[PDB]
Design a protein around this ligand. Structure first.
Ligand SMILES: Nc1ncnc2c1ncn2[C@@H]1O[C@H](COP(=O)(O)OP(=O)(O)O)[C@@H](O)[C@H]1O
Ligand SMILES: Nc1ncnc2c1ncn2[C@@H]1O[C@H](COP(=O)(O)OP(=O)(O)O)[C@@H](O)[C@H]1O
Lengths: 31, 62, 375, 54, 54, 31, 375, 31
């Protein structure tokens, strides 16, 4: 019975982190 | 220095999980035990109350 | 209870006193900085009754007490009351008598010397503490937050200090001390709630308003837009339960009170607000300092826990700051409780054992010694 | 004294059965709160442990 | 009859006293149920209304 | 139970995504 | 009966109703804010008899009426009784009709907004007034006394306001609204006259006590000395003749009542007295303001007419105030009725004719408009 | 007749002497 706010944002903020982490590694490799 | 911060997160997250569990479980144990107990106390009191009401009616006839 | 002569640590504000022992990462107890006294003539005989009540006693028995705060705008004006607070704070709840343990008390960087001198004198002559130190609140906040650099906003009940520190150095020419604080925000709320039909004029009533503020108020990321809707519709109102079962419903006043931090003119204060106060401290520091201070706006003290304040302070500085530059606020959940924690950190650092004034040096020099030894 | 005691026997017993009833009617309605406020809040907290598992 | 009526009046008075105590306790329990319920339902409405970003 | 799980997970994810994002932005921005 | 559309001016307080037309130097008529109702069953037929009586009618027939005051410590709650008071004030005394005249009413600066909204609503909807303007009592008090700078001490029947104004500007953070008033003195005197063997509890008795207070009371410059002699000798006693021929002799109650203004604890109030609120309202202002406010403490309202009141407050303020600086109370003969006069001054200013809410703007916006149009 | 003549003359003289005295005091105090 998750509250949508917590489920949706925990996953989205988790994804911002994972995506940003991969972007940091990727961009760092480029730079 | 940054190890202090890591130690703080280690204790806070070990505490968080201990707490999510303790917060919930201490209430579920106390609370469900309390209502189960007092649901029974409530029923037993209601039964006794009915029995006393009956006893009072019987004495009134006596 | 203690197995070592650890220093005892307290952060004594115009609001509350946080207390615990050196070496911990949290206070063990909190007391309001209050001493209460009855304003009525006793009629019954044999009901006990104290001449004065301290801390939580003062609030629990407040129905007939006038409640006074011994600390105002960062300093102790009534030290007889602080001695009762300290006995209660150190011995009744923490269970440690200062006689066998060093004590650390705190102050703002420009706090009048008379206050650090009395804090030192009281603990040495009334409590017989073996050693003393009076600490800078900004130092303590930076230790707790893991910083050596940043602007410390200690925005509590008494005074907003606003001091830049870089690589552990004070940058005093850039301090923007401001007589704008949480006590004034409460007074403003009492006046605007009066406009709504709920006048508050007595101590019990004052304490209710401070409770309303702490539970219902916020600053808002964008005040004028938040007010435009809150002042126009019930959809942004929130109720509060008064002690007698009555209720109060509050609209834009819910955020207009906290807004005084950004708009001090609401209380007749000559100020552009806490974000320009912060900005000017960064602005006045050297050009190779500024980048680190823009990236480290440090939140300590009360009011730092209003909803929207961490996001609002970063936005407001960003709006004043040059482009390209990264503006960042240091505002974790452990925000503000950073000053008590720092007191614990400092008291227990191995590099700070020589900084303790012992009750040797103290009696030879007298309390003026704190001005020569603490910093 | 008997009329007063009988009247009081009735009023006191009436108060007893009135209170036993208001108490039952209290407790019974009260246990409903008692059994559902903790179970609702308890299951809410149970659910929270799971609600927060994301 | 009086001793019996006084027994009933006093029995019932002692019993009503106990019942009155049961009510005082019951109401305190009720308040605890309501207050805890209120606190839980509201602490969650507010915790979730403010804690929306995760 | 107020959402204690969230209060801390919230701090964890906001901090972790902000740090990961700061890294993503720097990793590219450093050029 | 007027030959010009002059504004009507009226102070509808918890005590008296003062009214006249703008441009005069005094209200034309003054009477109590009372609507009375029979508390008995009629037995004679063809006796006329109203359901309710107003003002002087309410007092004239009071032997069988219960008397109510629609204004509660400065706010209007019983608007229906006030409609009757206004109708009587305007048509049976001034012989004017609001329909043909703009109307000015007044309230204290921290008076709940509901008061200004309800007064505006009724004058526009039941009296069809072409325009309205709710004035600030503090503004009107200084206009009448001749000051742009000073403290308004409006100590009348409802509430004491205590507001500093400098160069025509409010200094609102320093307002000390206090729940201490002439209305409390009437009830307190009923209780201390009970101590003397003359109990007073009913409306008629309250009106008798209000008359005793108004004719016999004073505060005195030195309370304790006046008390010591009044409590020891008949030489400080004064008699009062009651409506039914009874005579009451009053001693130290003659001043102990009024003294509550300086010692509010007599009625259970948590307050230091009117002289301290005056003092603090000045002390909270900037030092370049204080020099002008201490020299201009200005009296308005009732109780300011008591012998020793201006000297009593000036003495206490002076004792609390710093030396070199001069402290003075302005207490003109136009006392108790000076706010009405201020209303006349405001209503007749050329600079005020743009401040009116017209009966166009009113209907488009509703009564909440007063909150934006007046101040 | 209550002393109406006095009530006003009293206000006149108290105000005039207080003002004159305030002037006397300032005239010297200004140095
Ligand atoms: N979450 C909050 N909401 C509203 N106001 C707050 C909050 N937390 C603290 N404040 C206010 O800050 C003041 C407390 O001052 P404080 O700085 O905490 O003293 P200290 O330095 O010992 O910590 C009080 O006026 C309190 O109302
Ligand atoms: N002889 C008097 N001495 C002192 N006060 C008086 C005297 N006569 C009338 N008053 C008081 O004036 C008060 C009327 O209130 P008022 O001051 O006119 O309202 P406002 O505060 O708006 O000016 C009443 O409490 C009344 O008792």
């Amino acid at each position: 019975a998750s509250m949508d706010a917590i489920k949706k944002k925990m996953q989205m903020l988790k994804l911002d982190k994972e995506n940003a982490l991969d972007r940091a590694e990727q961009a760092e490799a480029d730079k | 220095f940054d190890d202090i911060h890591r130690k703080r997160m280690e204790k806070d997250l070990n505490e968080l999980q201990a707490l999510i569990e303790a917060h919930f479980e201490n209430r579920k144990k106390e609370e469900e035990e309390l209502v189960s107990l007092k649901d029974r106390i409530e029923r037993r009191r209601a039964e006794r109350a009915e029995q006393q009401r009956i006893r009072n009616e019987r004495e009134k006839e006596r | 209870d203690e197995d070592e002569t650890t220093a005892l640590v307290c952060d004594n504000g115009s609001g509350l006193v946080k207390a615990g022992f050196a070496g911990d990462d949290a206070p063990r107890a909190v007391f309001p900085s209050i001493v209460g006294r009855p304003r009525h003539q006793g009629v019954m005989v044999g009901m006990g009754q104290k001449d004065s009540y301290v801390g939580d006693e003062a609030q629990s028995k407040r129905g007939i007490l006038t409640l006074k705060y011994p600390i105002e705008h960062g300093i102790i004006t009534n030290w007889d009351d602080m001695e009762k607070i300290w006995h209660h704070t150190f011995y009744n709840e923490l269970r440690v008598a200062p006689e066998e343990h060093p004590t650390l008390l705190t102050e703002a960087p420009l706090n009048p010397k008379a206050n650090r001198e009395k804090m030192t004198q009281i603990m040495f002559e009334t409590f017989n503490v073996p050693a003393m130190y009076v600490a800078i609140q900004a130092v303590l906040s930076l230790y707790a937050s893991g910083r050596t650099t940043g602007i410390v906003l200690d925005s509590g009940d008494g005074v907003t200090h606003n001091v830049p520190i870089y690589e552990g150095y004070a940058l005093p020419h850039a301090i923007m001390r401001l007589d704008l604080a949480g006590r004034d925000l409460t007074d403003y709320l009492m006046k605007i709630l009066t406009e709504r039909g709920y006048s508050f004029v007595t101590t019990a009533e004052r304490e209710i308003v401070r409770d309303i503020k702490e539970k219902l108020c916020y600053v808002a990321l964008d005040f004028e837009n938040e007010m435009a809707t809150a002042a126009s519709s019930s959809s942004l109102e929130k109720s509060y339960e008064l002690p007698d079962g009555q209720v109060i419903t509050i609209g834009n006043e819910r955020f207009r009170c906290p807004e005084t931090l950004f708009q001090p003119s609401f209380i007749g204060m000559e100020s552009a607000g806490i974000h320009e106060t912060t900005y000017n401290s960064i602005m006045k520091c050297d050009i190779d300092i500024r980048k680190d201070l823009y990236a480290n706006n440090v939140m300590s003290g009360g009011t730092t826990m209003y909803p929207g304040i961490a996001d609002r302070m970063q936005k407001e500085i960003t709006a004043l700051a040059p482009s390209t530059m990264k503006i960042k606020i240091i505002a974790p959940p452990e925000r503000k409780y950073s000053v008590w924690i720092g007191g614990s950190i400092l008291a227990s650092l191995s590099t700070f054992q020589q900084m303790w004034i012992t009750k040797q040096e103290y009696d030879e020099a007298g309390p003026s010694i704190v001005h020569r030894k603490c910093f | 004294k008997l009329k007063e005691a009988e009247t009081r026997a009735e009023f006191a017993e009436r108060s007893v059965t009135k209170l036993e009833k208001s108490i039952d009617d209290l407790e019974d309605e009260l246990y409903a709160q008692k059994l559902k406020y903790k179970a609702i809040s308890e299951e809410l907290d149970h659910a929270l442990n799971d609600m927060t598992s994301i």
